[PDB]
Symmetry: D2
Subunit: 390 residues, 4 copies
């Protein structure tokens, strides 16, 4: 693990005290400064936090100020950077119906102020990305929330934030994080797709992208790799949260690759074996996971390293997969690269196509319909590389 | 049922022979002229079809020609219109890896030709919408499909169709139909969101929208009404396919309202209790369902009528819900309408918001967080309206 | 709502303060005597609780005794009974790996002790059923739990509890409550089926049954009504927890009928329209739900009453359904009752079946296969009864 | 793969012509004798079949007789055996509402005769297991099927079959195969648990067990390895069907290990690293899968071989896993084996347990509650073994 690997961890990840919906915390609170030292140590290049993770909701400026100074010291000494910050718009009871989209007008005004403030701190620490997780934006009942009005209000708030950042010269990028449910019955912008469509409607869309999370897409049983590929095609992959999940159930937040292992592999392959050797993605490889409730601080550090471990083992196998002449031969036989050739010849339009008898009148669909694509075999070669059997 | 209600059915719904993945057909073939006659009789205002549902794959021109004239005569006599047409790019073995996105370049070329042909016929019959269902676009294995190249090719093909329509003066609108899976392990553009985001990237986006299907969103456990609300917000709801489903499992295609009843109710409320007093959506209410395999032709006509009956029954209760004073009161208590009031006062920006001590510095979040929204009570009044209990 | 309806509620239901996985409690603590009062007022005939709901974990004998006496007075004054009691084996950190099947043997012994104590209290308050919810029984990782050993230890603990109850003459019945996941990644005895199979291997199986909960089976997308019909077939429906859920996602605990309305309808029909006119189930109709986090104490009593109103409105429609002559006619056409007639004639065995040419050699499968069952029409009539449209 | 590996395939697997719910077959039919030869050649020890796979539905006795004789010769010459047989009670239209549980009495009678006839052929080919897949036993609508009457009729048919077998001295064991849905909306006996609980109610339970299939339990998002563990505890694992699936969606029938890889790994560990060095299960390792629709006959044989490769690679990794002193040390730290030690001391009863102050009075819940189990670390070593990183 090198700083060039860009592994980052949220302070709320290793810091999770393990108080779930059904029981009390099983671990004590982790000191930010300590987190900073431990992460530095296991090989992370950066740390992220929610305003309320570092400074307890409601601290006076004196306390608030003190905490920041100490945190700043720790980054200093260790060389860790803060690539991204986020705001907590979900924990306090006032946000029970959302921040930006709460039906109560006062709550919406307050939620914007809370974020502007976090934007200030972010800028001060050199953060380039503001992640927005609208965990409480949504509903349990259909008649309780006007989605249209809600989207108008989500948009109004975001447009203000971009206005401010651009005026203060912060140069932040905004990353909307999709989640289908939990804690609300249904959350607005439920998938990477919905989040991308929404961003295209903002005032300065170029400043906005998405921060998709492994488990979030898997909670709806979607293919995370395929969703990232789409995000990459759109050029809206501004950040990414890696973790593990076992399908449609509560959000598990397991270590990266401890859930759908086969998808974890295709994912590393997509991010790393980009066009011309180079990665297809350049930002932080952020782990937004939780050390299982059954573990102690020993278990905590273990799990932090397991994340890095899993990513580096998969990368290694994805590289070997692509480099294998037999895979290279199977890729050819399956015509994977033929999808890159335009369907139409150069300068060809409808008329030329309509005049080409070979594309219709004289085409033998039955004969082409019978040739196999060799996909099972290519798939089997991939898994054998994953398994270290090749 | 009135023509003003705009209920339409696909030829392939009532005409489905009930040959499933595990058994033979239990019903004989339905004659198209017959279908037009029976549908006219139950109150449908229009009929739709895939090319291959009307004219059997590979019919010579004489044959094809003959079928169309008979069909147009039936239309004529009954007063039924053809609001939308679509193309079968999924049945024939040549389409096993997709039509527009098949790895094989020749299939992609053939796929476009098959659609242009269907476009002409739709144009000829007065159809206004071309529905595109990319059922074979996707994969079973991640290494088999280059998603980026696939999107490029899906885009390449649609740009061409719009070019053609526009040059010819056809005036067609194009509606992409999302589905998460089945027949492919994962289909490209899996949710309403992914499809909207994609469309925003074509050459003439104003010409493209979506055709979301109740059951397809429910196969991922998404809130159908909430995704339609988002589609309407983007102004991309070009068509809608109504049916029923029981969560994530194979596509059931039940009668509209026979799966998630509460969501069927909230959907009808959304489409009908629109902006003025007026519907929020003005297109065809299309039923894309299948009469259960256990039914004979009496069952088929019963199921067609059930679709219209479910809609009209829900419409009537949605209307009553909104007209109830007790509901008005509950809506007031839950602050539904307050979401429609901008968060900011007219002419207020971040400078004015930052200057407002009451939006943050003097804001009593604890007090606000203690008041209830009364959402359960609102939901209970809605359900009682649904049950005719009020 | 009469006391004969036998609506009961857990203290933890209306007492949920709404501290979820992602946020703080939105409501203050509810006083138990008050709860007894409030529930008696809305129509409940009994109240239930976990040891720890009534007496704070780590209460001195004096305090504990103090609480109980006040609680009994309240029941006294109100006329409410305690039909069932349960034990909390999921909250305290020591149970992080389970109670009865913790890998740690000291935890198992402690868990048993904790239950015996509740049995005593239960026996003393007149409870008839001990519900066992193994929420911490399971694992996040396959190699961490020997399922066979865990089943042995689960059995070993239950055998003892039955032994004790029988010897102290408590007359308790034990109801195992299945849940597929949450809080453990995977819980042991995930469905009503697994729980029944397990019970059958105990020493005095006649003393054990299950307590299935609507939401738990729906978390796996199973048909709750159908599972309950299987439970009744086996005679293992010792208790039932009613609530609502929107498929595979976190456990929602909505008001009964606020999730899958169609299945809530069919369930009420099955429990009430039992053979010989009479209900097929005579135990408590217990609501194990949670007033939404967006609600205050008024929303809380509103939600309690909604559970009762939903059950009674559905009951009324299930009876009207069964009483409708047209329904009677559709049931006959669907041959619902013909399934009750044995396949074999009295005294026929394989020898006589083999001799019947009409059951095989001369059977016309094709003519039988062509006749429809009229199921769609029958379903349509059920729904129309549910909507009060008939 | 040796014959000792006992890998078997259904004739219907490699012989699936790939006609799905949305398209035509992509492959021509496979001759059963050719399938026998090909299978033997890749290392299979046995072949299985549904009556209708070998002998076309409605074949005259001369035709049927010829097929069987040719079949037997191939078996002879290759040395392959027939370990299990099954009956098709799902394809023909007559079975649209089920076989044994159809509402129509005559269908129930014919279903039993179809099965008796297959039992004869089975017994003559030396099969020891009869698998029962009730694919059509269920409903799309709740009111269409009396479940209780259905279970009565199911049991009635099964008792007769056991009777006939016992009387003819066939010595067959019966394995019910659970499936949650598809082709019916909901299938009776939906999970391995439901089928086990049902079997326990038959006249001769000892002759009955289950045939669970990987994808089927994953269709409900259940832990397959954990449910197999429970089946082994009950001693009802009479047979097993191995394949791949991606959570809740249509039945994919991918090659074993191509779905949930991590669960495939823990499944192979459970079966082979049984108690006493030896496998915990000794029946056939049957592959009930389908070669993807995109493949030709080369892809079909490649996929048959992929199943066996998949199983042997995971077996090798499972073995190394367990022989690793670091893994053993982690197991000890996680206390996995301590679950195998009774909770109660020998001769200890409730009286003695009540007497141990160390189990309650003097129990430090708080101190125990703070020790970590090291489960993450153990999971990490398990995956490093699978990855061949160790």
């Amino acid at each position: 693990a090198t700083r060039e690997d860009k592994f980052s961890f949220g302070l709320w990840t290793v810091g999770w005290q393990a108080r779930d919906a059904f029981g009390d915390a099983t671990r004590t609170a982790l000191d930010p400064v300590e987190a900073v030292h431990k992460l530095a140590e296991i090989g992370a290049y950066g740390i992220t936090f929610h305003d309320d993770d570092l400074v307890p909701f409601g601290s006076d400026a004196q306390t608030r100020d003190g905490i920041i100074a100490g945190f700043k010291k720790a980054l200093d000494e260790t060389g860790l950077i803060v690539p991204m910050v986020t705001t907590n718009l979900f924990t306090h009871p006032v946000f029970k119906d959302g921040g930006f989209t709460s039906n109560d007008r006062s709550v919406r005004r307050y939620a914007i102020r809370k974020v502007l403030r976090q934007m200030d701190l972010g800028a001060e620490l050199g953060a380039k990305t503001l992640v927005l997780w609208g965990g409480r934006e949504g509903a349990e009942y259909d008649s309780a929330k006007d989605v249209s009005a809600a989207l108008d209000r989500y948009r109004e708030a975001l447009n203000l934030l971009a206005q401010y950042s651009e005026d203060r010269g912060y140069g932040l990028r905004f990353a909307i994080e999709p989640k289908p449910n939990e804690p609300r019955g249904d959350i607005l912008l439920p998938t990477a797709g919905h989040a991308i469509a929404f961003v295209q409607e903002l005032e300065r869309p170029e400043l906005f992208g998405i921060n998709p999370e492994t488990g979030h897409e898997q909670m709806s049983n979607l293919n995370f790799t395929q969703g990232i590929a789409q995000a990459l095609w759109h050029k809206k992959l501004f950040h990414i949260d890696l973790n593990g999940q076992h399908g449609p159930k509560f959000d598990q937040d397991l270590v990266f690759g401890h859930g759908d292992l086969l998808n974890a592999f295709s994912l590393v392959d997509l991010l790393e074996n980009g066009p011309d050797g180079a990665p297809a993605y350049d930002g932080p490889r952020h782990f937004d996971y939780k050390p299982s409730r059954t573990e102690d601080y020993d278990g905590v550090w273990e799990s932090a390293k397991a994340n890095i471990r899993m990513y580096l083992l998969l990368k290694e196998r994805a590289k070997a997969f692509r480099a294998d002449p037999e895979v290279q031969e199977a890729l050819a036989a399956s015509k994977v690269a033929e999808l890159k050739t335009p369907t139409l010849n150069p300068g060809e339009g409808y008329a030329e196509l309509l005049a080409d008898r070979s594309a219709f009148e004289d085409y033998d669909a039955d004969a082409v319909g019978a040739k196999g694509f060799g996909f099972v075999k290519l798939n089997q070669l991939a898994i054998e590389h994953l398994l270290g059997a090749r």
